[PDB]
Design a protein around this motif. Structure first.
Motif: not given
Lengths: 292, 292, 292, 292
Positions: C76-77, C5-6, C72-73, C80-84
């Motif tokens: 989305q990352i 991702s970096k 987008t990715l 997904g991190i904020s959701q958990i």
């Protein structure tokens, strides 16, 4: 409790002009009738929607909430009517068929002549396939029957599948009126190649034997009609579906320029999701399963 | 085009049960009247909605899509009328206020005390805030005034804002017998921590000084009253808004434990969108702007 | 194969500033190292994303499309991190409980103490309920256990329900210092009425006996604590759940003023959708089913 | 923060089988390395994603949500690399053109003929247009140039437009061996009508003069090629664009029927969003602007 939609239109117009007589003029009704219709709407909703004692006209709180309610109802009515415009024009025997362009142009004309003249004679509404959402539109009921190519998802449950035919992508080039191909695979240099998208079904077919031929990609398109036209314009060679170049092969406009190993098998299917369709849809499905 | 909602209900009933007589009796109407109402619906939408050549009666494709449209429309009408039924019972002086629970219980009592008698004495309708949709309700007119904490969108145009007050989140712990806090920060190790949601405003405030103090989180909630109750039950420490623990601090039930660097500033506001409200609404807004 | 991702963030910054050295400085990375990271990204995606031979740096077509892919990715990352975030901070034994405010404040402290008799205490994340979407939130997995009032949908399959307790809405009034109902129903004259929304659960219960009493609504709120506070301020009467005014009844500050037929039964439940929860979730559910 | 997509693959496989030995060998990795990669994903997200203390393995709540996040990220990665797979095979002079089928077949051949040799000779990638996401394709950079019909959104800012041509929809019928149209408007009864979707551009043009002729809709399609084929197969009349029936008009195959007022004007355009494209894109755009 009965709400008449033109009361919703009455109330929205009154909300924007804030005058009873002018709102009556905008909606082509007399002022007493418009006032009585606003009052009928208020009686049905069970609330004073408008402060009738002050000029300009102010909305009550209930009126302000029912304004967005009425706008939503009006737009929902309009959308629901637009959704059935095409279908309603064709009648109760309309069959929604989503199809690939070449599949549609090849299959629909012969289906159209096999229909009998009775009370359940199907009327076709054929729309070009949405490659990304065809399966979702099939599930949701946006279409009754899908004419598509081999798909590992649509071929399996919960969908019903029917193989219409299995043909071949033939590598073809144009000819001179003497009848001889302008391009070949025999030279040492690559040949101008008009390709499909490499991720599409037909592109995935061509990629199998790509290593067996020297090609130079000069043009890409998902439309087989486009590749066909560009082949006919001496621009290059292309793998075209056999059913799309029958006249061109009976005439000597085009010629297959490969070995049998370059001819690639393809299949196309009719797909459905509803276990039971309306009579016209079942007749269309039956005729598709027995394309003579 | 005027669609009457009772026709939509007739059509839904005729779609669930599937012949005209039973659906007409279910709708408490005569058989010719029911047939005429269904046919009026069909003539208005411009679509044959049922195929009368088959028993049981089935929907045409148009009928199948318009059944979804009719269900949506009827549910929306019922929702609008119930939402209006709550509001109309309250007078034309009702002011719809969405508020965070803490702010409602801290500000609405004195606000109610400030209401003098008159023709436009406000009647408050106070609902728990949902910031994901309260901004949209403010724009559409579902609520008049929003009592919320500092928000970078609500504080700016197109919304009007008034800073009600600026207070501090105080890290507090329950006191022991007659004075001293049971938990502290100078003492050894991390302490049991009753935290907010890390995405909430107050939790975002605590995350500023998170690195300065050793905490172990044991309970999370978005409700200050929950954290306050669990603090009073000697379960741990929590950053609580100063206005929610006034009596519990004056009395020796709770105590502040940190250094002044741990007290975190917070601000709360009244927000509006409509440039001109009804007299009761402008009255409530004026009282909020002078809550001092 | 393996995208890091970096590299996505590297490419986004490079696409903004269109210079390798500046993008490297923004990324806190060496210039040759940044060029190598972009080259590795291009090797992994299988295409040159950037023309390096031109100033300023231009994006290739593949780079143009992968810019959208990378944005987008990355978003989305972050989602997904904020959701958990909250779930991760508390550990694998976190139990997400949506609850009505009054029910949470009444039940969660007793549950929290029950966690202490029997060792190993699970961690609660208690968020206020949104009845409009709480059912959908329970289905999607946004919460493990819902603490709510009697609901015809949540009480039945596909949901599992447990009745926690049956209580009464008591019509209560403030009392003078000597102790006497300030408002009452013996007078043939109306009473200032602090009401719920008539469409809410408790409001729908009060609607059953509305005709047996003379009420004039002066205030509406969905928060029981709000009505309780306004009752204590001698502003009017209200139907309050008995579990929320036990000490006020005991301290005689508030008193029941209605007939026994005015006391209305209510029930509150624990609801769930998953057949199997994580061990902490099943422990919390077991303790809720007992609470006896 | 650096998330490696192979870690997301590790997590998805581990979630599907819940066996570490099987998941590690299914990923063709030694067991210690597989466990270390799982732990690296957990340390990067900052959350314990799996609970090994239990067997058969099951996910932590955070792991349960991150499974959906990982599936989404992986599918997006594969889809973006597949989108680039088609472009990378083509050169840096690829111009991505979305186009309505008939416009593509009418305009792309002559454009291909105009391409002289040089360093930035364009390579066309022509995809069939879906207008409801065409504008998004243009804005995000997935599409360079759009060949479509008159559109009130794409004709204005923030888009650049260029009028290619103005032509007519001609009502046409197939004619016999002698040369007389099989269908006309001086006939008896309404004529069989092959129509467009009423929501489409060309159908919106036909609705203009709907009432001037007796028509019975027997077939509907969004594809002019379909209507053209069914006209040529003597199935009915249709409004066809002049550019699509030129050879048929010049030859015996098809004849224009009706009065001059039935011919409907249509316009088509080239649209773009990027102020500056790569040299090949600007060449394609200039050629489109000079097609006259």
């Amino acid at each position: 409790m009965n709400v008449e939609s033109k009361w919703l239109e009455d109330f929205l117009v009154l909300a924007k002009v804030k005058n009873f007589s002018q709102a009556a003029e905008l909606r082509n009704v007399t002022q007493p009738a418009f006032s009585r219709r606003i009052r009928l709407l208020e009686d049905t909703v069970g609330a004073e929607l408008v402060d009738r004692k002050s000029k300009p006209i102010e909305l009550t709180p209930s009126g302000k909430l029912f304004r967005i309610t009425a706008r939503t109802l009006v737009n929902q009515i309009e959308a629901g009517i637009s959704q059935i415009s095409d279908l309603s024009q064709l009648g109760g025997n309309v069959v929604q068929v989503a199809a690939a362009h070449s599949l549609a142009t090849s299959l629909i004309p012969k289906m159209q002549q096999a229909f009998d003249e009775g009370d359940y004679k199907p009327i076709l509404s054929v729309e070009a396939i949405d490659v990304d959402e065809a399966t979702k539109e099939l599930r949701e009921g946006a279409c009754d029957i899908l004419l598509a190519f081999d798909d590992d998802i649509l071929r399996l449950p919960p969908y019903q599948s029917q193989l219409i035919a299995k043909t071949e992508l033939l590598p073809v080039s144009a000819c001179d009126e003497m009848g001889k191909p302008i391009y070949d695979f025999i030279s040492q240099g690559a040949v101008p190649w008009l390709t499909y998208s490499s991720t599409s079904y037909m592109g995935r077919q061509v990629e199998i034997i790509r290593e067996q031929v020297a090609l130079t990609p000069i043009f890409s398109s998902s439309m087989t009609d486009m590749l066909k036209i560009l082949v006919l314009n001496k621009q290059g060679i292309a793998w075209l579906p056999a059913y799309s170049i029958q006249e061109e092969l009976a005439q000597k406009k085009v010629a297959i320029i490969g070995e049998q190993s370059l001819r690639l098998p393809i299949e196309y299917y009719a797909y459905r999701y509803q276990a039971r369709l309306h009579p016209a849809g079942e007749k269309v499905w039956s005729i598709l399963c027995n394309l003579d």
